[PDB]
Design a protein around this ligand. Structure first.
Ligand SMILES: O=C(O)CN(CC(=O)O)CC(=O)NCCNC(=O)[C@H]1O[C@@H](n2ccc(=O)[nH]c2=O)[C@H](O)[C@@H]1O
Ligand SMILES: O=C(O)CN(CC(=O)O)CC(=O)NCCNC(=O)[C@H]1O[C@@H](n2ccc(=O)[nH]c2=O)[C@H](O)[C@@H]1O
Ligand SMILES: [Ca+2]
Ligand SMILES: [Ca+2]
Ligand SMILES: [Cl-]
Ligand SMILES: [Cl-]
Ligand SMILES: [Zn+2]
Ligand SMILES: [Zn+2]
Ligand SMILES: [Zn+2]
Ligand SMILES: [Zn+2]
Lengths: 524, 524
């Protein structure tokens, strides 16, 4: 048999440095995990031991920490080049800074092929970008070749800023003819590498004839065979085996997110490129694996510009930004309003004639707001100030919730009101009125929401059967602070931009801010 | 006697072109008035006839039309230079584009002295600006000299954008020692030329010893001796005679605004510089005086860049901007909200630790909103589109109103509701609730206003005895659409920036707008 070792990462999300166990800032260095220096150590060890290795990224290196804010993708090109990645698929967050912010820092500087078979361009953009990403690449591996075929979420226009000169085609439609074409070119070992989520990954494995292995991302899917090595709970075995429409067994892999694990799959192929066997497991990059000293020293060099940036003025406030718990856990607070207005602003995407914007609504638990910002420092706001408000290294995510689920969340918001608990909700695009003299679970007496499918935004009563888009912290999407109804009842969940970066972008755009408390939340 | 002819303008406010009778756009050319070409004709005729002439401007050439938007003061330097003005005093609107927007276009390019004795600078600004404006200038006139001493409203920090490195001193305090100094220098004929308003002009005439004549502005004061030649109603005789604390009769003049009239005062002096007699009258610059063809042709040349600018994209909207009368005369409309939010934004000035901003409140009659803007032209908004919404050539002014006066205005807003009448009020920083089943004059059931003297802006009930600052159209400050209570009861009124320019600046700053209808006005 001819044996190939596939090493793979996905949704690294700017975790260039080692992190805590939960992927937020490293505090206790001796129990920290991930980061590119440690990844370098483990990839170099595997390349010493195994003759045929590919190192692949399934997209979403962009967006997640101050690294991306400051270096805008140049850190991705530089450090992925240092690790000698073999190929990368485009993820949705690679379009966060528009097509221009992808061509220049990443497409022009990467030393490896960047792939997506289902993205087409038209007009002058088509000539500008031609060949800078590719539908696939054939790579020599020892005395063999392997075809790698890319794909990117069709939902990217709702999740990022690709512009209106790119079209995201159905993945399976776009992929099949490229895989058929590779077969005519005597390429019998084919990896589909892409960024659409585990459910779509399984469909590609099932339906795209001639794919031998699917290496995915986007859904942050953790798969494991055996007892798991950390806190992540497996969604299935690694690899997850799909029985294809042509009768083959096709392994599907993913490796969680944030650079915490290195995916590792060993495939044995026969001479005609059929998969004889597949086995492996993601490797937890914990503190037992040393950081490579050379990469670590380059990281510490690049950190200087970050530390400088962190104390620069982003913008000014002329009002006190009240993120005190005595306000934000008991009533509408103007820090909560600022943060939700920034969330909505970050999620302005290109629209149909059927909506002014696809999302208008925001919720934010008051327990997530961790500091005020005083306006008396000449009004200045810095990244460092925002990091005190939003210290958990979260994201502001897009979900779909039925009205009944949202009413349940608002009842939960006040179920034990008066104890300074974290679940009290700050809001945007929602006007709620509570009557606290009513029994827990029956205290919401009015709940109106801003329309999306309307040319003039205005408020209407919340409808129990209608499904609403809502921007909220990943902590809430995951059921934190007791919002189990959100985790259990949501219809869709996509991970969004870094919390601090959403607020910092909005402050920088506005220049001078003055958020008021204006009646979004009232008590009767 | 030695006879001096003083020609004077004030508060021209960017009326470089001839205007209608009411100072808005010229429609019927053969009955149009003012403009610099016609002014040139009349000044040149007077200079042929009278040997000793000074042509003076008492400030506020800046701000008022698209001329100022595009040329930013370069049009003022150029055309005031072409008319060979002798001196100008700084007005409040000369600081609309900051100190930098006054030094460069105006101070560096004017060929005549620009004066203010009561403005001091500190820090590096003091060295940058030293001698670019002067407390006074001594001018030769025939074989004599005349001293001209400038002054500028002490309220300029609340009316414009002078920055925090300029200090506006009390006028009389600053003026007296400069006038005493001119007397030691054998200058016995002294004109105080300045921009503080007719009431302060009379105080200077009364109290500043040795001033022979006061030439003022800011209050748009029309003075006339005899039957008046147009629609303006005189506030007093021209000149208005003040009996000074040292026993002299001191003439005080002003000449309305907008370039409609040329002030003309003839003074006879004895050999020691005492005023023997004063008489004259503003001259209405009507169509019987021809436009100078050379100046007119230069005006038409400079107009090209205006016409080009008028169709340029200022910014984008992703929502329909509903300025229809069926919305804005019956309920909260999102064009009204946009326009009021722009008004408040235009009136952000440097604040004390005693307020977040000195003004938070806005009213706008729905009859003043004259078009919607469709968002389906790729979202683009142009100046030309804004001119359709706001076609009257007005300003957004600052007034002080007791709460009782404002409650009366809100009752007037709905006194005959249902007829599509113009007085229905759009708002900012105010939340009103009407009950239309109540009798006219008793339909306002809740009226809450955004605080100013607070670090976190929030809403409280309106207090009948408290005096509120409010930004509103000059049409309303003047009692239009039946708001006689505003005209009759207001405590303070200062004229503000051009209506279209306030909105265009705000759109350009925001880049992408999406105003909602959000509950500022409700019916119960
Ligand atoms: O926040 C508290 O009530 C607990 N405290 C109070 C304090 O710090 O003064 C101490 C503490 O240990 N807090 C750190 C962990 N966070 C929380 O306990 C609360 O903070 C919020 N939280 C925590 C983690 C997170 O990722 N997101 C988030 O919103 C939740 O509302 C949660 O209830
Ligand atoms: O506006 C109307 O109801 C009268 N119309 C209706 C229409 O044009 O379809 C005709 C008209 O002659 N209008 C021009 C003059 N303006 C007005 O009559 C109304 O427009 C508003 N107006 C007028 C002049 C002004 O300077 N500011 C201002 O707000 C007032 O609400 C006033 O009631
Ligand atoms: Ca094969
Ligand atoms: Ca004298
Ligand atoms: Cl999925
Ligand atoms: Cl006055
Ligand atoms: Zn991701
Ligand atoms: Zn993704
Ligand atoms: Zn003026
Ligand atoms: Zn003025």
């Amino acid at each position: 048999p001819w044996e190939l070792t596939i090493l793979h990462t996905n949704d690294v999300h700017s975790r260039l440095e080692q992190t805590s166990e939960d992927s937020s800032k490293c505090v206790d260095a001796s129990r920290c995990m991930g980061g590119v220096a440690r990844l370098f150590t483990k990839v170099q060890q595997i390349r010493r031991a195994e003759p045929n290795v590919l190192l692949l990224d399934a997209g979403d290196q962009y967006q997640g920490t101050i690294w991306f804010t400051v270096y805008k993708g140049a850190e991705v090109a530089h450090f992925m080049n240092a690790l000698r990645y073999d190929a990368m698929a485009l993820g949705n967050h690679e379009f966060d800074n528009g097509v221009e912010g992808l061509i220049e820092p990443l497409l022009k500087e990467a030393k490896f092929p960047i792939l997506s078979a289902n993205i087409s361009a038209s007009g002058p953009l088509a000539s500008q970008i031609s060949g800078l990403y590719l539908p696939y690449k054939v790579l020599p591996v020892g005395d063999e070749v392997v075809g790698i075929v890319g794909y990117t979420s069709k939902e990217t226009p709702f999740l990022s800023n690709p512009g209106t000169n790119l079209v995201f085609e159905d993945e399976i439609t776009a992929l099949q003819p490229e895989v058929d074409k590779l077969k005519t070119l005597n390429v019998n070992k084919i990896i589909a590498l892409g960024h659409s989520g585990f459910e779509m990954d399984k469909l590609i494995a099932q339906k795209v004839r001639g794919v031998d292995v699917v290496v995915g991302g986007h859904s942050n899917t953790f798969l494991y065979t055996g007892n798991p090595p950390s806190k992540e709970v497996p969604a299935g075995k690694y690899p997850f085996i799909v029985t294809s429409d042509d009768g083959r067994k096709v392994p599907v892999v993913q490796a969680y997110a944030f650079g915490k694990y290195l995916g590792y799959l060993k495939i044995e192929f026969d001479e005609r490129g059929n998969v004889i066997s597949s086995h492996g497991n993601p490797i937890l990059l914990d503190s037992s694996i040393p950081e490579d000293p050379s990469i670590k020293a380059d990281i510490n060099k690049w950190r200087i510009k970050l530390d400088d940036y962190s104390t620069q003025e982003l913008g000014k406030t002329i009002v006190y930004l009240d993120g005190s718990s005595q306000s934000c856990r008991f009533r509408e607070c103007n820090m909560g309003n600022l943060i939700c207005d920034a969330m909505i602003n970050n999620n302005l995407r290109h629209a149909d004639e059927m909506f002014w914007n696809h999302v208008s609504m925001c919720i934010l638990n008051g327990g997530g707001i961790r500091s005020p910002i005083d306006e008396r420092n000449d009004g200045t706001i810095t990244w460092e100030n925002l990091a005190a408000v939003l210290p958990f290294g979260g994201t502001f995510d897009l979900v779909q919730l039925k009205g009944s689920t949202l009413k349940k969340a608002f009842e939960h918001s006040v179920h034990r009101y008066g104890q300074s608990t974290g679940e009290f909700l700050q809001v945007g695009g929602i006007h709620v009125v509570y009557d606290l003299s009513r029994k827990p679970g029956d205290r919401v007496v009015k709940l109106d929401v801003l329309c999306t499918s309307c040319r003039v935004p205005s408020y209407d009563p919340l409808k129990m059967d209608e499904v609403y888009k809502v921007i909220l912290p990943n902590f809430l999407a995951n059921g934190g602070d007791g919002f189990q109804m959100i985790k259990d009842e949501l219809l869709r969940h996509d991970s969004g931009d870094q919390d601090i970066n959403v607020v910092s972008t909005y402050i920088s755009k506005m220049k001078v801010i003055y958020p008021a408390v204006e009646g979004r939340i009232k008590f009767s």
